[PDB]
Amino acid sequence: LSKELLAEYQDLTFLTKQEILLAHRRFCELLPQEQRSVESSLRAQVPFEQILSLPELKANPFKERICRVFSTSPAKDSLSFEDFLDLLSVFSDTATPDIKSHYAFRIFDFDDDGTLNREDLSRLVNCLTGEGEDTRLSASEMKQLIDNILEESDIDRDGTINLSEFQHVISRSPDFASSFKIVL
Numbered sequence: 001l002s003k004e005l006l007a008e009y010q011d012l013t014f015l016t017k018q019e020i021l022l023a024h025r026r027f028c029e030l031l032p033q034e035q036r037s038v039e040s041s042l043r044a045q046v047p048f049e050q051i052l053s054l055p056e057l058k059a060n061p062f063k064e065r066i067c068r069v070f071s072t073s074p075a076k077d078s079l080s081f082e083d084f085l086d087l088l089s090v091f092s093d094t095a096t097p098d099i100k101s102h103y104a105f106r107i108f109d110f111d112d113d114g115t116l117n118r119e120d121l122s123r124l125v126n127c128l129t130g131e132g133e134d135t136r137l138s139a140s141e142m143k144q145l146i147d148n149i150l151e152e153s154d155i156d157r158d159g160t161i162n163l164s165e166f167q168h169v170i171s172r173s174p175d176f177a178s179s180f181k182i183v184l
């Protein structure tokens with residue numbers, strides 16, 4: 001499951017009629033009531049801040065990467081309520097074990113490159129711990145922490161975790177396996 005097939009679903013398969021009609025009304029109130037024109041709403045995008053009106057996805061230490069990666073735009077200066085809302089609803093329940101990992105591995109990779117480094121792992125665990133504190137932070141102790149986990153989990157000790165290794169390593173030991181419950 002590559003980012004390709006996913007892009008195909010994002011096209012015009014994740015956009016229903018009832019959800020779009022109802023969602024449009026909700027996003028309409030936030031926007032000038034005078035511009036209630038549909039030909040303008042569907043032909044026009046929604047400001048960035050306008051989206052921030054949902055502290056929900058904000059709780060995500062990387063709401064910028066999740067939206068940018070999940071959303072699509074030319075200069076990435078605008079955000080559509082379609083993809084944005086789709087991400088929420090999709091990650092609300094549709095979040096199936098399969099799409100769960102795929103989405104994760106993608107969001108987990110802070111570099112958004114594909115592979116995962118010791119830092120990426122120190123970001124998800126830290127950020128969640130309590131961003132802005134001496135708590136679980138990158139250091140000598142945290143250095144041997146990831147290494148030890150990689151050795152106990154993966155053998156190739158490639159020094160990094162890929163998609164295949166991510167799905168396993170994560171669900172290979174009560175470690176992140178138990179915490180793998182819900183992440184975003």
Ligand SMILES: [Ca+2]
Binds near residue numbers: 109113115117120
């Ligand atoms: Ca990386």
Ligand SMILES: [Ca+2]
Binds near residue numbers: 155156157161
């Ligand atoms: Ca490995």
